[PDB]
From TrEMBL, chains B, E:
Protein name: Hemagglutinin
Coiled-coil portions: 8-46
Subunit field text: Homotrimer of disulfide-linked HA1-HA2.
Similarity comment text for this entry: Belongs to the influenza viruses hemagglutinin family.
Domain of life, per lineage: Viruses
Cellular location(s): Host apical cell membrane; Virion membrane
Entire-sequence positions represented here: 376 to 426 of 566
Organism encoding this protein: Influenza A virus (A/Hong Kong/1-4-MA21-1/1968(H3N2))
Gene assigned in the entry: HA
PTM section of the record: Palmitoylated.
């Protein structure tokens, strides 16, 4: 009954620089406002409460400010482990509401190590063979992956799976699974993954012939 | 026999009212930085009397 | 016979500030702060 | 130590009921408030409800205003949440969260201070509301060409078609951790999720080491340990 | 059967009280013309801090 809007949806900040977040709130709110750092695969952790008062034994680089409507959250010295998502809550309307969430990125442009994987024999017998292409370690997250089967692009049969940013080398990993039938797989010969990246001079493509390693 | 018990809803209703105004009185304190000088060293006259 | 007494109510009401409640629903309210402008000097 | 533990949850058909427990252990004397907050994977946080003292809350969000009811058992120090008439969008990771207020508020120690911020969060219990509990079919991914790249090789395991989430995966019973990349689940056109876990190790261990996956899916209790060998040429 | 009717006198008394304070709130109350300057272009020193 009192919506919270964070801005932007996701921001990219180099490690060391200060990252300022926004928490615009409809209707006045000042007394209670809490920031959180929810790292992927973990529960949220309290950072600041009220508006500026930070939680117990949290780093001093987390700063909080704001009044009534506009609220900000600035991370002074950024670390590679700060790739978490941040939220903000409010009082009161006897009904606390949370924010939408702000994803924080870190940063060198890394080259995607493309790897292709033919469907296993156990999957071929099931009746549906799905070819997999891996893009291990690359930055940024943006990566245009295309499936070319017999010099022909295939759309509507591929699903993009992207992992969260790594806590150390800060590189993403992408996987695409081109699902096709048993006869639809044997219908064609060559399977190629047309991979184009931001920091890619030429489109690197890894392929394999059907029935040959 | 003889017993005693408190009513939670009536007590909560009073606490909800007082906590509401307790928030109203300590909310958003003004933030002032570079203001005017209020304690002075020597006599200045017109400007000092106005400050 | 039964004789009930009650007040009126609106389907959508404005929220106002009071001494005890910050957001309380009332049937009608008016704005006392002029925030809009015509942009032109008459 | 102020940690609490959430028990219960699981898969339920829409329209059914389910209550989740929250063992409040530690510093909490349980004259302070407690709250429930749910989050679905792919969505943000959302406050659900709160409890205070005895029956002072009575505080539920508009989404569950007529469905969820919050219980408190101070004798056994456990917080409950009876989730009745569950719908599809109720699938979320329900978190039990501590509640703290500025010391100026909360006049009587037991009753509710209408301004709380959550400080200590719980581990969370995942509750899935849908319709089918399929076991995952694990397919290995073998390297092709010649040592994949020439210097370092890549291998993978596939977890196709299963419901619901999650699935635990390890390599060599957890002995292999360096270079492992477990990808998130992606719901397919059939409605079943799909997961893939890959690991990059040097090509010098292509033959001298036998790599095994540890796909564990407790919801259907299907645990396959598939052997990953190179596409023998 | 079942019917409904409003009381004019009880509502009129409440309407009179609200309109009474409604008139108490709004008014010409003040009419100000030439006052001080509030927005400044460059730094002026002491008097700028006071204005
Ligand atoms: C009358 C109706 O059906 N819905 C109204 C809508 O028209 C109005 O804009 C809104 C106030 O923001 O309150 C509600
Ligand atoms: C008085 O109120 C304060 C909160 O403002 C509370 O902390 C304190 O325990 C109360 N004491 C008594 C004696 O009621």
């Amino acid at each position: 009954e009192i919506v919270m809007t964070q801005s932007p949806v996701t921001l990219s900040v180099s490690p060391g620089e200060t990252a300022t977040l926004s928490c615009r709130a409809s209707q006045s709110v000042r007394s209670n406002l809490a920031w959180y750092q929810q790292k992927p695969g973990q529960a949220p952790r309290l950072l600041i409460y009220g508006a500026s008062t930070r939680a117990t034994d949290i780093p001093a680089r987390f700063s909080g400010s704001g009044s009534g409507t506009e609220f900000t959250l600035s991370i002074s010295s950024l670390q590679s482990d700060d790739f978490a998502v941040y939220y903000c809550q409010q009082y009161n309307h006897w009904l606390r509401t949370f924010g939408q969430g702000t994803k924080l990125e870190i940063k060198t442009v890394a080259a995607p190590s493309v790897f292709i994987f033919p469907p296993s024999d156990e999957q071929l017998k099931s009746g549906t063979a799905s070819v997999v292409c891996l893009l291990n370690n690359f930055y940024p997250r943006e990566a245009k992956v295309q499936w070319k089967v017999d010099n022909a692009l295939q759309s509507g049969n591929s699903q993009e799976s992207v992992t969260e940013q790594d806590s150390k080398d800060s590189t993403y990993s992408l996987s695409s699974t081109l699902t096709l039938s048993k006869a639809d797989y044997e219908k064609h010969k060559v399977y190629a993954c047309e991979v184009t990246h931001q920091g890619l001079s030429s489109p690197v493509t890894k392929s394999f012939n059907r029935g040959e390693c | 026999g003889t017993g005693q018990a408190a009513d939670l809803k009536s007590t909560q209703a009073a606490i909800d009212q007082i906590n509401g105004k307790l928030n109203r009185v300590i909310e958003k304190t003004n933030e002032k930085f570079h203001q005017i000088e209020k304690e002075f060293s020597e006599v200045e006259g017109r400007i000092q009397d106005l400050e | 016979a039964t004789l009930c007494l009650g007040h009126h109510a609106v389907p959508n009401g404005t929220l106002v500030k009071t001494i005890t409640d910050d957001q309380i629903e009332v049937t009608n309210a008016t704005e006392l702060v002029q925030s809009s402008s015509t942009g032109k000097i008459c | 130590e102020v940690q609490l533990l959430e028990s219960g949850g699981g898969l339920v058909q829409p329209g059914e009921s389910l209550r989740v427990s929250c063992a409040a252990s530690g510093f909490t004397f349980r004259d302070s408030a407690l709250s429930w907050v749910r989050q679905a994977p792919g969505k943000g946080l959302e406050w659900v409800s709160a409890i205070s003292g005895n029956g002072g809350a009575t505080y539920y969000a508009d989404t569950v205003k007529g469905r969820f009811t919050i219980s408190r058992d101070n004798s056994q120090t456990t917080l409950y949440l009876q989730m009745n008439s569950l719908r599809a969008d109720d699938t979320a990771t329900y978190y039990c969260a501590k509640d703290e207020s500025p010391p100026i508020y909360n006049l009587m120690p037991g009753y509710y201070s209408t301004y709380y911020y959550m400080d200590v969060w719980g581990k969370g219990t995942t509750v899935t509301v849908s319709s089918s509990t399929k076991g995952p079919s694990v397919f290995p991914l073998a390297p092709s060409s010649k040592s994949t790249s020439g210097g370092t090789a890549a291998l993978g395991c596939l977890v196709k078609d299963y419901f619901p989430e999650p699935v635990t995966v390890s390599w060599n019973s957890g002995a292999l951790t360096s270079g492992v990349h477990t990808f998130p689940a992606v719901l397919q056109s059939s409605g079943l999720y799909s997961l893939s876990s890959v690991v990059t190790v040097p090509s010098s261990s292509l033959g001298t080491q036998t790599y095994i996956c540890n796909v564990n899916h407790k919801p259907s209790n299907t645990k396959v340990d598939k052997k990953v060998e190179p596409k023998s040429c």
